[PDB]
Design a protein around this ligand. Structure first.
Ligand code: BZ1
Ligand code: ZN
Length: 257
């Protein structure tokens, strides 16, 4: 099935998911000189104080931390959004080398990794319905650069040994996602899609301007995960990013001048 290899990677996805060649695909390159400052955009409101994390799992494409989304406990509002979006999960994309790994780029610059916090619009009642709507999901994207360690990420890094291979999961309670946010919440926003199959065009992207720093030791631990299941030939989980797609008839807006 689909993946990130020579024979099943992003250049092949359109054969099973024709919307890969659609009009609002992600990720995109953010051209900072062509983005438009929009003073009508509100500040983001991130309310994560009551977040309840549940599990961490290797899904064969990335690793994911899942949250209890059965009530409004961890929500995103404001910015370009109408209504309330509940945090469902976060995951990362990363590279084999420090100079690649992010999905979005900024003036063609690639970061070492990209963190996606995935939220769904509560008016649609469940995430399955939300993915069928043009305003169903909001994904907060945060770039990672290599430098100083991020203390709030260490709890994640320390459990990765226990989910090395596809299909492994572990209890992961009491994790506070506020520890992954940068100082500033200034952002770019544009209408886009999931960056993995099914590539649904249901996402309002909110990409933060300020990267977080993580240490080389932290990102090295990501690169030791496996795409394969236990008992299969080892293939390291690296370069699980989709390249930038055509902007087409979209404008990227910025919350800041
Ligand atoms: C390996 C599958 N990853 C998909 C899963 N989901 C898709 C199915 C939900 O249907 C019920 S998801 O909405 O949690 C989401 S968000 C992104 S991204 N990279 O942020 O655009 C990928 C995904
Ligand atoms: Zn993602």
């Amino acid at each position: 099935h689909w993946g990130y290899g020579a024979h099943n990677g992003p250049e092949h996805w359109h054969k099973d998911f024709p919307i890969a060649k659609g009009e609002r695909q992600s990720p995109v390159d953010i051209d900072t000189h062509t983005a438009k400052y929009d003073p009508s955009l509100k500040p983001l409101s991130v309310s994560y104080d009551q977040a309840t994390s549940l599990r961490i799992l290797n899904n064969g494409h990335s690793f994911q931390v899942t949250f209890d989304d059965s009530q409004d406990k961890a929500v995103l509002k404001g910015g370009p959004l109408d209504g309330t979006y509940r945090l469902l999960q976060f995951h990362f994309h990363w590279g084999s080398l420090d100079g690649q790994g992010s999905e979005h780029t900024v003036d063609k610059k690639k970061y070492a990794a990209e963190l996606h916090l995935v939220h769904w619009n509560t008016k649609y009642g469940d995430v399955g319905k939300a993915v069928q709507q043009p305003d169903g999901l909001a994904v907060l994207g945060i770039f990672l650069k290599v430098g100083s360690a991020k203390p709030g990420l260490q709890k994640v890094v320390d459990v990765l040994d226990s989910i090395k291979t596809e299909g492994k999961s572990a209890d992961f309670t009491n994790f506070d996602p506020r520890g992954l946010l940068p100082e500033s919440l200034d952002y770019w926003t544009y209408p886009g899609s999931l960056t993995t199959p099914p590539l649904a065009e249901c996402v309002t992207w909110i990409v933060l301007k300020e990267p977080i720093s993580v240490s080389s030791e932290q990102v090295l631990k990501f690169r030791k995960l496996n795409f394969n299941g236990e008992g299969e030939p080892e293939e390291l989980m690296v370069d699980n990013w989709r390249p930038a797609q055509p902007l087409k008839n979209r404008q990227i807006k910025a919350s800041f001048k």
